[PDB]
A and B are shown apart, each in its own frame.
Chain A
Amino acid sequence: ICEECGKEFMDSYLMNHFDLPTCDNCRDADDKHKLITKTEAKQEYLLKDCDLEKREPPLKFIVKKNPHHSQWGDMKLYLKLQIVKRSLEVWGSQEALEEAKEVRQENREKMKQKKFDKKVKELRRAVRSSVWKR
């Protein structure tokens, strides 16, 4: 039983995968939902490891071959509708997503300048201590 066109069937693309209540014949690759990787969702929607598998209900994934490795491992694929339903559930509203993204993108600019600051304090410490002693 589809939840978009109401057609009766055995199976389809989804609802054996992402548990999404639709038939395969809507399909709308770029007009309802697409496949997003676990790494992409994790570094884009700011989801941790303990939200794709433990926030009830747990959304599952699809294992496929890693494209530019071919002998090394896997590539998980979550659904983009299931991620934006989860990111809207874990982080308040849509706007609360990006406002906590601005504080993190300045934090990586914060660590870039202080690692060029702690080296000035450390390397000049060994050359000031030779002058300070007598």
Chain B
Amino acid sequence: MKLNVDGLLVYFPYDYIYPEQFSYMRELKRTLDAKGHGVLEMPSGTGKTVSLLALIMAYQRAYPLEVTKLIYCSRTVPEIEKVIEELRKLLNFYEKQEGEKLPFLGLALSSRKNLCIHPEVTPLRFGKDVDGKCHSLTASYVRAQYQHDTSLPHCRFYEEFDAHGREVPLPAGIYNLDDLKALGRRQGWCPYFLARYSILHANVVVYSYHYLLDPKIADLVSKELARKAVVVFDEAHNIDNVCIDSMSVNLTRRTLDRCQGNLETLQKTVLRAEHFLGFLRRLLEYVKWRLRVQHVVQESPPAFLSGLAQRVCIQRKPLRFCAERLRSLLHTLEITDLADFSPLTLLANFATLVSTYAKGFTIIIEPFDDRTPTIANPILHFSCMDASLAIKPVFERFQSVIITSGTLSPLDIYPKILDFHPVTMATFTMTLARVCLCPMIIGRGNDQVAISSKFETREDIAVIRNYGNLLLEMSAVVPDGIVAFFTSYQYMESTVASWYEQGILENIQRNKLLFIETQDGAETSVALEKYQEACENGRGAILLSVARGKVSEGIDFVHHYGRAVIMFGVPYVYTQSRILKARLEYLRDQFQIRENDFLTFDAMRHAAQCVGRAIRGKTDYGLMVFADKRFARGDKRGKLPRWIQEHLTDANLNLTVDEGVQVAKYFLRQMAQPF
């Protein structure tokens, strides 16, 4: 299959392509020749992954001096392994079509707990534990006596790596994480340091977000890799929530009381440098003095640094090198583990963030515990407001960076928050042989009562009955699986336990089993494996869950799991938290974003992410109701993207509960029949 986009000869690994998928390769080539960014919305997960890889890998053959390396930041380790398996399928197609071999290697990067051979350290569960026991065997003072080569502890694989792993590189043959461990097994090398060494000489590199947008990581691993590359941020809805949490720390009473134990253990070891311990003891009793107050919430992002020089007299010139010398002090102290000093590194990371980064930051000290009048639980948040302060290296260092997901809801918000100027900013819609989706907005109830989940319209039983009368009448006409996302956990409890006291939850269990998705991961995976079992045998099930949850982002509901997806209200965040109430005051002055146009943007990208989870494939069909009155408004249904908005007609816009069934009952009957 020789497929010709506007100037290039793209070798596609399939036979039939979709008519919109040609324009996705056409609009992505328009970015790469212009050497600029791009915000492309493209619905599916696969197909998008194999058409983005068919173009760029074929682009670096015809213009091998303009692009050299493709970086592919995916969300987490399951989609890291999925992209590489879509690359062998493209490489082996090129192996059959051309009959030759190539100088083409593709890697995959992850943590040390995903690339590990050493048996005494690999079953360690927590990720901060495997980083310490590796460092107990790979530190430069542990190898200092290993120049003698004694029977003193070490890593067998790491000392066998740097003696033979620099002369010869990896030849070819795209590597998964399991292939790098298998190559590390039969050769005896470390997989983690082989992948990090060979990341400088590769052509496709697939890691997570945090190697590139996390500032205390990206200068160590992705520093000198490529100046003319292509970065792809796949499934990049929450870039804003990633660049905020990477530059935001959190301090409480439990953290600072553990830092006194770290300074206690540092006092016993110096007697066995002294100005730096009195430096940290000065800083620790100030932040404890600042949490000592029981007063109103207050914010002072550079004025914290002025009052830190009054009672304590510590300036910002030694405070900038606070986290540097603490990394140097533990090196000269020759300590065994470094996970035990994790509260003190968090205080050292807090000290180097107030000193340097103060333009769009805040320090929100909240002695007032949430929802309770007087309970002694203070906490100060060092919250970042500006999501463009972690991509200013990435938008500058690389040549062209593409932000692609399936549900970028307005495309003109992402270049407003993130300070950059794209060159295409395009959207697409999937082609279909049927109507593969039937979105509806089930508004008012069966007795003409409004259904919305406001804050005043939650206690009254004229709405809780109309949610129970909806899930009852959809569980009798939908086969094999209904996913019901609620807005929170305290609203899922106060509705299910108020359906049970009425005669509504008795009649839902006659039709389908119901499996509540709880917060702890042990009960959830039990209730999820029985859900996928109940959809496969006769009964069918209802997985009622929370929209800002684990199941809403991770688990993909392929066909006959979740034929319907029911949104029980607009999934807003808590719109009166003092952190969110301060970020929106930064989004009003800077970028002139309205305060109400961001709460709905944040909600219509989490209500369109979990609804868009119901359809992944060719023959997948799926109902998707929106059970709130407020979804019908123009500033809300105009947000949700163009591939679920081009089937939302004006008839399915204020359907009542009984009228929404006969749209669903006619839709599933029509889809059940062959082509």
Q: Which residues of A contact B (CB under 8 A)?
A: 60-64, 73-74
Q: Cβ of B592 < 8 Å from any Cβ of A?
A: yes
Docked-complex contact A62 and B592, CB < 8 angstroms: yes
Q: How far is the CA of A99 from the CA of B592 in the complex (A)?
A: 36
Q: Point out the residues of chain A lying under 8 angstroms from B596, CB to CB.
A: 73-74
Q: Cβ of B89 < 8 Å from any Cβ of A?
A: no
Q: Cβ of B620 < 8 Å from any Cβ of A?
A: no
Q: Point out the residues of chain B lying under 8 angstroms from A60, CB to CB.
A: 592
Nearest Cβ distance between residue B326 and chain A, in whole angstroms?
A: 37
Docked-complex contact A74 and B592, CB < 8 angstroms: no
**15 A-B residue pairs with CB within 8 Å:** A60-B592, A61-B592, A62-B592, A63-B588, A63-B592, A63-B593, A63-B594, A63-B595, A64-B588, A73-B595, A73-B596, A74-B588, A74-B594, A74-B595, A74-B596
Q: How far is the CA of A73 from the CA of B596 in the complex (A)?
A: 7
Nearest Cβ distance between residue B580 and chain A, in whole angstroms?
A: 13
Q: Point out the residues of chain B lying under 8 angstroms from A74, CB to CB.
A: 588, 594-596
Q: A61-B592, A74-B588, A74-B595 are in contact. List 12 more A-B contacts (CB 8 A).
A: A60-B592, A62-B592, A63-B588, A63-B592, A63-B593, A63-B594, A63-B595, A64-B588, A73-B595, A73-B596, A74-B594, A74-B596
Nearest Cβ distance between residue A63 and chain B, in whole angstroms?
A: 5
Q: How far is the CA of A23 from the CA of B593 in the complex (A)?
A: 25
Nearest Cβ distance between residue A58 and chain B, in whole angstroms?
A: 13
Q: How far is the CA of A74 from the CA of B588 in the complex (A)?
A: 9
Of chain B, the residue at the smallest CB distance from A74 is: B594
Q: Which applies to chain A's interface (DSSP): helix, strand, loop or mixed?
A: strand
Q: Point out the residues of chain A lying under 8 angstroms from B592, CB to CB.
A: 60-63
Of chain A, the residue at the smallest CB distance from B585 is: A65
Of chain A, the residue at the smallest CB distance from B587 is: A63
Nearest Cβ distance between residue B582 and chain A, in whole angstroms?
A: 13
Of chain A, the residue at the smallest CB distance from B588 is: A63
Of chain A, the residue at the smallest CB distance from B592 is: A63
Chain B interface residue count: which class?
Answer: under 10
Which of B562-580 touch A at CB < 8 Å?
Answer: none
Q: How far is the CA of A62 from the CA of B596 in the complex (A)?
A: 15
Q: Point out the residues of chain B lying under 8 angstroms from A62, CB to CB.
A: 592
Which of B549-564 touch A at CB < 8 Å?
Answer: none
Q: Point out the residues of chain B lying under 8 angstroms from A61, CB to CB.
A: 592
Nearest 4 pairs of A and B residues by beta carbon: A63-B588, A74-B594, A63-B592, A63-B594
Q: How far is the CA of A60 from the CA of B594 in the complex (A)?
A: 13
Q: How far is the CA of A38 from the CA of B156 in the complex (A)?
A: 72
Q: How far is the CA of A60 from the CA of B593 in the complex (A)?
A: 12
Mask, B581-612, CB within 8 Å of A = 1, is: 00000001000111110000000000000000
Nearest Cβ distance between residue A60 and chain B, in whole angstroms?
A: 7
Output the residue of A61, A63, A64, A74 with the most chain B CB within 10 A.
A63
Q: Point out the residues of chain A lying under 8 angstroms from B595, CB to CB.
A: 63, 73-74
Q: Point out the residues of chain A lying under 8 angstroms from B593, CB to CB.
A: 63
Q: Point out the residues of chain B lying under 8 angstroms from A73, CB to CB.
A: 595-596
Q: How far is the CA of A74 from the CA of B595 in the complex (A)?
A: 7
Nearest Cβ distance between residue B585 and chain A, in whole angstroms?
A: 9
Nearest Cβ distance between residue B600 and chain A, in whole angstroms?
A: 12
Nearest Cβ distance between residue B437 and chain A, in whole angstroms?
A: 33
Q: How far is the CA of A61 from the CA of B594 in the complex (A)?
A: 11
Q: How far is the CA of A73 from the CA of B594 in the complex (A)?
A: 8
Nearest Cβ distance between residue A123 and chain B, in whole angstroms?
A: 30
Of chain A, the residue at the smallest CB distance from B596 is: A73
Of chain B, the residue at the smallest CB distance from A76 is: B594
Q: Point out the residues of chain B lying under 8 angstroms from A63, CB to CB.
A: 588, 592-595
Q: How far is the CA of A73 from the CA of B599 in the complex (A)?
A: 12
Q: How far is the CA of A60 from the CA of B595 in the complex (A)?
A: 17
Q: How far is the CA of A74 from the CA of B597 in the complex (A)?
A: 10
Q: How far is the CA of A74 from the CA of B405 in the complex (A)?
A: 31
Q: How far is the CA of A73 from the CA of B595 in the complex (A)?
A: 7
Q: How far is the CA of A64 from the CA of B594 in the complex (A)?
A: 9
Nearest Cβ distance between residue A61 and chain B, in whole angstroms?
A: 8
Q: How far is the CA of A74 from the CA of B599 in the complex (A)?
A: 13
Q: Point out the residues of chain A lying under 8 angstroms from B594, CB to CB.
A: 63, 74
Nearest Cβ distance between residue B182 and chain A, in whole angstroms?
A: 57
Q: How far is the CA of A60 from the CA of B588 in the complex (A)?
A: 14
Q: How far is the CA of A116 from the CA of B233 in the complex (A)?
A: 65
Q: How far is the CA of A62 from the CA of B588 in the complex (A)?
A: 8
Q: How far is the CA of A52 from the CA of B596 in the complex (A)?
A: 21
Nearest Cβ distance between residue B215 and chain A, in whole angstroms?
A: 27
Q: How far is the CA of A99 from the CA of B520 in the complex (A)?
A: 71
Nearest Cβ distance between residue B365 and chain A, in whole angstroms?
A: 22
Q: How far is the CA of A61 from the CA of B588 in the complex (A)?
A: 11
Nearest Cβ distance between residue A69 and chain B, in whole angstroms?
A: 11
Nearest Cβ distance between residue B618 and chain A, in whole angstroms?
A: 43
Q: How far is the CA of A63 from the CA of B594 in the complex (A)?
A: 7
Q: How far is the CA of A62 from the CA of B595 in the complex (A)?
A: 12
Q: How far is the CA of A63 from the CA of B595 in the complex (A)?
A: 9
Nearest Cβ distance between residue B383 and chain A, in whole angstroms?
A: 20
Q: How far is the CA of A62 from the CA of B593 in the complex (A)?
A: 10
Nearest Cβ distance between residue A50 and chain B, in whole angstroms?
A: 16
Nearest Cβ distance between residue A77 and chain B, in whole angstroms?
A: 11
Q: How far is the CA of A63 from the CA of B588 in the complex (A)?
A: 6
Q: Point out the residues of chain B lying under 8 angstroms from A64, CB to CB.
A: 588
Of chain B, the residue at the smallest CB distance from A66 is: B595
Nearest Cβ distance between residue B412 and chain A, in whole angstroms?
A: 14
Nearest Cβ distance between residue B16 and chain A, in whole angstroms?
A: 43
Nearest Cβ distance between residue A78 and chain B, in whole angstroms?
A: 13
Q: How far is the CA of A61 from the CA of B592 in the complex (A)?
A: 8
Nearest Cβ distance between residue A19 and chain B, in whole angstroms?
A: 13
Of chain A, the residue at the smallest CB distance from B576 is: A71
Of chain A, the residue at the smallest CB distance from B589 is: A63
Q: How far is the CA of A64 from the CA of B587 in the complex (A)?
A: 11
Nearest Cβ distance between residue B587 and chain A, in whole angstroms?
A: 9
Nearest Cβ distance between residue B599 and chain A, in whole angstroms?
A: 11
Q: How far is the CA of A92 from the CA of B593 in the complex (A)?
A: 34
Which of B630-667 touch A at CB < 8 Å?
Answer: none
Nearest Cβ distance between residue B636 and chain A, in whole angstroms?
A: 15
Q: How far is the CA of A62 from the CA of B594 in the complex (A)?
A: 10
Q: How far is the CA of A62 from the CA of B591 in the complex (A)?
A: 10
Q: How far is the CA of A63 from the CA of B593 in the complex (A)?
A: 8
Of chain B, the residue at the smallest CB distance from A71 is: B576
Nearest Cβ distance between residue B591 and chain A, in whole angstroms?
A: 10
Of chain B, the residue at the smallest CB distance from A63 is: B588
Nearest Cβ distance between residue B543 and chain A, in whole angstroms?
A: 35
Nearest Cβ distance between residue B207 and chain A, in whole angstroms?
A: 39
Of chain B, the residue at the smallest CB distance from A61 is: B592
Nearest Cβ distance between residue B584 and chain A, in whole angstroms?
A: 10
Q: How far is the CA of A72 from the CA of B191 in the complex (A)?
A: 55
Nearest Cβ distance between residue B273 and chain A, in whole angstroms?
A: 44
Q: How far is the CA of A81 from the CA of B177 in the complex (A)?
A: 64
